[PDB]
Amino acid sequence: LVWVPSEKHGFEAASIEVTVELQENGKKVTLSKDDIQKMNPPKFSKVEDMAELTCLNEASVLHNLRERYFSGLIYTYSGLFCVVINPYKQLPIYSEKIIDMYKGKKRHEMPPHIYAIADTAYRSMLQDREDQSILCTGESGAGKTENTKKVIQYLAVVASGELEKQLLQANPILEAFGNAKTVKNDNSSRFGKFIRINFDVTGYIVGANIETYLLEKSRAIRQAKDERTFHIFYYLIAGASEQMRNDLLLEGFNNYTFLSNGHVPIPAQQDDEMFQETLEAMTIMGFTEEEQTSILRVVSSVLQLGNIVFKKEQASMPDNTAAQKVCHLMGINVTDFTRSILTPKAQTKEQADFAIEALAKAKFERLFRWILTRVNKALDASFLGILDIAGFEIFEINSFEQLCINYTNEKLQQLFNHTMFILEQEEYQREGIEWNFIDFGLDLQPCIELIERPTNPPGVLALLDEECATDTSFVEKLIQEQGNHAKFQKSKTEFCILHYAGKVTYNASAWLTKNMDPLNDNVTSLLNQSSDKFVADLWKRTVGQLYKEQLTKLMTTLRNTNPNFVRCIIPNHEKRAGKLDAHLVLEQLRCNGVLEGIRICRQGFPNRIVFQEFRQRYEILAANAIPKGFMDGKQACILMIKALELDPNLYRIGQSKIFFRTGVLAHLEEERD
Ligand SMILES: Nc1ncnc2c1ncn2[C@@H]1O[C@H](COP(=O)(O)OP(=O)(O)O)[C@@H](O)[C@H]1O
Ligand code: ALF
Ligand SMILES: [Mg+2]
Numbered sequence: 001l002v003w004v005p006s007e008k009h010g011f012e013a014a015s016i017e018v019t020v021e022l023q024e025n026g027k028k029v030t031l032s033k034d035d036i037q038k039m040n041p042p043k044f045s046k047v048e049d050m051a052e053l054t055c056l057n058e059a060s061v062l063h064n065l066r067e068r069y070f071s072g073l074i075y076t077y078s079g080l081f082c083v084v085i086n087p088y089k090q091l092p093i094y095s096e097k098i099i100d101m102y103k104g105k106k107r108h109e110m111p112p113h114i115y116a117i118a119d120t121a122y123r124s125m126l127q128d129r130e131d132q133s134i135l136c137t138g139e140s141g142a143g144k145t146e147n148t149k150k151v152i153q154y155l156a157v158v159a160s161g162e163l164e165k166q167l168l169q170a171n172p173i174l175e176a177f178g179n180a181k182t183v184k185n186d187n188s189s190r191f192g193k194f195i196r197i198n199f200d201v202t203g204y205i206v207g208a209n210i211e212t213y214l215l216e217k218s219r220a221i222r223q224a225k226d227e228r229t230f231h232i233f234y235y236l237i238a239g240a241s242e243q244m245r246n247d248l249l250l251e252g253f254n255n256y257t258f259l260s261n262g263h264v265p266i267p268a269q270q271d272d273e274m275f276q277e278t279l280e281a282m283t284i285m286g287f288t289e290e291e292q293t294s295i296l297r298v299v300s301s302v303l304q305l306g307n308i309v310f311k312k313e314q315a316s317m318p319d320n321t322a323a324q325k326v327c328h329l330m331g332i333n334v335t336d337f338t339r340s341i342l343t344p345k346a347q348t349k350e351q352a353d354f355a356i357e358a359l360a361k362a363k364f365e366r367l368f369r370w371i372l373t374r375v376n377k378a379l380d381a382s383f384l385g386i387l388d389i390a391g392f393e394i395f396e397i398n399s400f401e402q403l404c405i406n407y408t409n410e411k412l413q414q415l416f417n418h419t420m421f422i423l424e425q426e427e428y429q430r431e432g433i434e435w436n437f438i439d440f441g442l443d444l445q446p447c448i449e450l451i452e453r454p455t456n457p458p459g460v461l462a463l464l465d466e467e468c469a470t471d472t473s474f475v476e477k478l479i480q481e482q483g484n485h486a487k488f489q490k491s492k493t494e495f496c497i498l499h500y501a502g503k504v505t506y507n508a509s510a511w512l513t514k515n516m517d518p519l520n521d522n523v524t525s526l527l528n529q530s531s532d533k534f535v536a537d538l539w540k541r542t543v544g545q546l547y548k549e550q551l552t553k554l555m556t557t558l559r560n561t562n563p564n565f566v567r568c569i570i571p572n573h574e575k576r577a578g579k580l581d582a583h584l585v586l587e588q589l590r591c592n593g594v595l596e597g598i599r600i601c602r603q604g605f606p607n608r609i610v611f612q613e614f615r616q617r618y619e620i621l622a623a624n625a626i627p628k629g630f631m632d633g634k635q636a637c638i639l640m641i642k643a644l645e646l647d648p649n650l651y652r653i654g655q656s657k658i659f660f661r662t663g664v665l666a667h668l669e670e671e672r673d
Contacts, residue, residue, distance in 0.1 A: 391405075
């Protein structure tokens, strides 16, 4: 019996170039030897930790995952890291009762769960007095958020009671203004986010600070088919009280042009419901009724901006109604506004339209930054970062937003590679372990440099910053500079980047403008001194550049924390539950380095404890192991190990600690009880 490749399923069971006979079709086939992969004994049905597997190959991992999946188990430890496959359905596994069952539990004492990741990260923090970070990876839709949300849910329920109560409102609020339905995801985060929870030396939660990245402002004014803008718009429009309806001078879903595809209903969501849900959370978060109405008022103005209309001839808006409403909602002067918009320098429809849009997006980006800020005020020894970035996406038309998002995903995958494979081995040699380096063949440096290479060989981002000159002109130079670059491909101002997750063909249209983010300082000032305080508050070098900075500051913070990767796999592309796309899964398992991540956890020594700790934790397993009196950590360990009759292959004695093979300490622990 063996694993042979297959179309329907990544691999198929077949009994033995080689000529086997498929167990399903029965059809006898003749395939190369290198195409066959060994099956594992039935004893390995749904192993919780695939490092355990006797045979570790794509075929066995995929199988182990497929099985647990349809068995309702979506979490599977794979070496150090963990894998999660979107159930796309509700599962009875996130109760509070279960949070209890997982309290202070060791990874090996409980089936794989995001709670375990949360908890073990928690303890490890106190245990080694080192800042921790749980990093969720995954293509758009995989599950990064549902899981980030579970980690916070768990932590709030164990170390906290207001803070906790509000902590659990952070996302419900943020999601409402920064999430939106994309073809890939209905509740898609259109902005990355690093939630950092602060604890005291005791271990109790003390603060919490949320940092967000790359908010897709553009979505505020346009969305592709079957796509809708930020939830909050649909929420307010659909659930505002009649008095607010006309207080905000709100319209209908088809009275607003920024609402591209009018009202696009969500699966299992009710806008009117979510609106009260949002107001409830804002309430809990501590927002005053006026803070909330002021926020909702800004949302409305952003929609009304879209209704303004300019005509050709310069450009002139015959109908100022919208311009009137907008100003009414902004505490601005209709004529001062109309003037600053139509002539700050003559403006044509084309440029009048732009300015208005630019303002819309700018107005929203700030309302978000504000809400976030306010949330941070209300939420504010050791910290536990949690990173829910915007997942890799390849939409029909990929703009500058997607480049940044996917670039960040490439940056995160690399962080995984580095940690998992480089840092791992570095520590080996550094601690003096008999170890010969293993090039696991996983490096994204190239592509990453092809984008963020500031100096020396100009990269996409910097070439642009330079560019700002047609957008197309940008593409032309980008080619002449990169063109050949391995992870580059000439294509309408389009080009292709071969991201680890796949080949994305970008469209540089408007990129120059997008990277500059030009506002109409005229109207901009008007708002700066709006009769309305909130507005005024809201309005009290290049984008690419700004991001690079923020990203690096993050990577660094992350660099100074013990990372815990949770690899989220998307099962299918039909937002369907119970449909595991064997190949979509295999591909994901591939670019995530999951197999290489399990090999190193096997070929190396994942666990590693300091002499003393090993001595105290397991001296009981060999009481008559160490001399009665003073016994140096090292010699003491060496004694105990001998006393335990540990196979020398199972460990290594480094300078300051013993390195153990996967699951060795585990067994030691089990024996210990
Ligand atoms: N463990 C889970 N339980 C329930 N639903 C989940 C789970 N994981 C993901 N989902 C489903 O997948 C969808 C999107 O996952 P999400 O967390 O939004 O991904 P991402 O942050 O990577 O964009 C949700 O709208 C939900 O229906
Ligand atoms: F909402 Al995403 F990756 F698309 F977290
Ligand atoms: Mg998300």
